Design a protein around this ligand. Structure first.
Ligand SMILES: Cc1nc(Nc2ncc(-c3cccnc3)c3ccc(CO)nc23)cs1
Ligand SMILES: [Cl-]
Ligand SMILES: [Cl-]
Ligand SMILES: [Cl-]
Ligand SMILES: [K+]
Ligand SMILES: [Mg+2]
Ligand SMILES: [Zn+2]
Length: 314
């Protein structure tokens, strides 16, 4: 009865396999795109189509109308994870394929457009509930809520212990998108790869590798073609500046990336970000998963485009 196979137009069918695919401006195509990626990376029998569709639409409803941390970010992040899985298909378990696409879709659920810092300084109730990874623990709690709605248990064919494992994959993957945790996790993986101690059969080493994959997916907008990366940078900065305004309303001077008066210093901020965060991220990931090379290559090309802006040629 699974004779209803999802298909895409010719251009999308070919380009969705490229790391630098952009999912386009047609919101009503994104659910079909996510199902197609699930059917091909996981299998057409991983999920009941009616529960997956109900789940997908409840998740979309619980993302907010914000410039960057929105439904389009959720699907873009999931597509990057699709491209890593299809190009390293021998390395992951059945449960990891199931959990990771869902983790990426759900990873910024109910994002208001504010950092963990603003929530601490504002004394938001979520900061009292979750002392560290504040928004990330909230995103995970929102995932569990949606899964627990009538007709939304997309994992209903799994045993109790398998359900419990995949929810633990999703919880750790979502927490790993807290960039404050990425610095420590990348350092550990760097030393582990360089001393030849890294071991993909060690569950605590899998946890770290999947963490880094989540960081790489979450930043994958710096790995698109220049026009996409430049336009998407306006979207995140719109959020940065709005948080900066809110820091000023609390009588607190915002850090520089969040001050809308420091607009002319965006090219230098981007330079700072690519060298301190992005390049190291895709470098370490290319070492562990060599087929993820095109992410690093496109990150280097965009770093070069920011250097051309700072010299006044772009
Ligand atoms: C010290 C500084 N840090 C930043 N932070 C960032 N700048 C830019 C991007 C970005 C987005 C889309 C397209 N191209 C670039 C970005 C994406 C994700 C995150 C994770 O929080 N941070 C980002 C700017 S100055
Ligand atoms: Cl809203
Ligand atoms: Cl709110
Ligand atoms: Cl159910
Ligand atoms: K983010
Ligand atoms: Mg986040
Ligand atoms: Zn994100």
């Amino acid at each position: 009865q699974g004779l209803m196979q999802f298909t895409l137009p010719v251009r999308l069918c070919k380009e969705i396999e490229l790391f630098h695919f952009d999912i386009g401006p047609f919101e009503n195509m994104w659910p079909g795109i996510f199902v197609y990626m699930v059917h091909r990376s996981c299998g057409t029998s991983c999920f009941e189509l009616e529960k997956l569709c109900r789940f997908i639409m409840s998740v979309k409803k619980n993302y907010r109308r914000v410039p960057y941390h929105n439904w389009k970010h959720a699907v873009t992040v999931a597509h990057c994870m699709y491209a890593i899985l299809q190009n390293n298909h021998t390395l992951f378990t059945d449960l990891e394929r199931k959990g990771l696409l869902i983790a990426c879709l759900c990873h910024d659920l109910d994002h208001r457009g504010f950092s963990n810092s603003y929530l601490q300084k504002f004394d938001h109730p979520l900061a009292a509930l979750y002392s560290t990874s504040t928004m990330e623990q909230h995103h995970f709690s929102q995932t569990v809520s949606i899964l627990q709605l009538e007709g939304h248990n997309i994992f209903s064919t799994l045993s109790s212990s398998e359900y419990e494992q995949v929810l633990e994959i999703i919880r750790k993957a979502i927490i790993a998108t807290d960039l404050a945790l990425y610095f420590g996790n990348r350092k550990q993986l760097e030393e582990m790869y360089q001393t030849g101690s890294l071991n993909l059969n060690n569950q605590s080493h899998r946890d770290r590798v999947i963490g880094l994959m989540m960081t790489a997916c979450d930043l994958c907008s710096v790995t698109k073609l220049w026009p996409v990366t430049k336009l998407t940078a306006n979207d995140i900065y719109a959020e940065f500046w709005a948080e900066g305004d809110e820091m000023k309303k609390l009588g607190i001077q915002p850090i520089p990336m969040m001050d809308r008066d420091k607009k002319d210093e965006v090219p230098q901020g981007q330079l700072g970000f690519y060298n301190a965060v992005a390049i190291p991220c895709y470098t370490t990931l290319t070492q562990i998963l060599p087929p993820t090379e095109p992410l690093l290559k496109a990150c280097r090309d965009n770093l070069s485009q920011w250097e051309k802006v700072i010299r006044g040629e772009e």
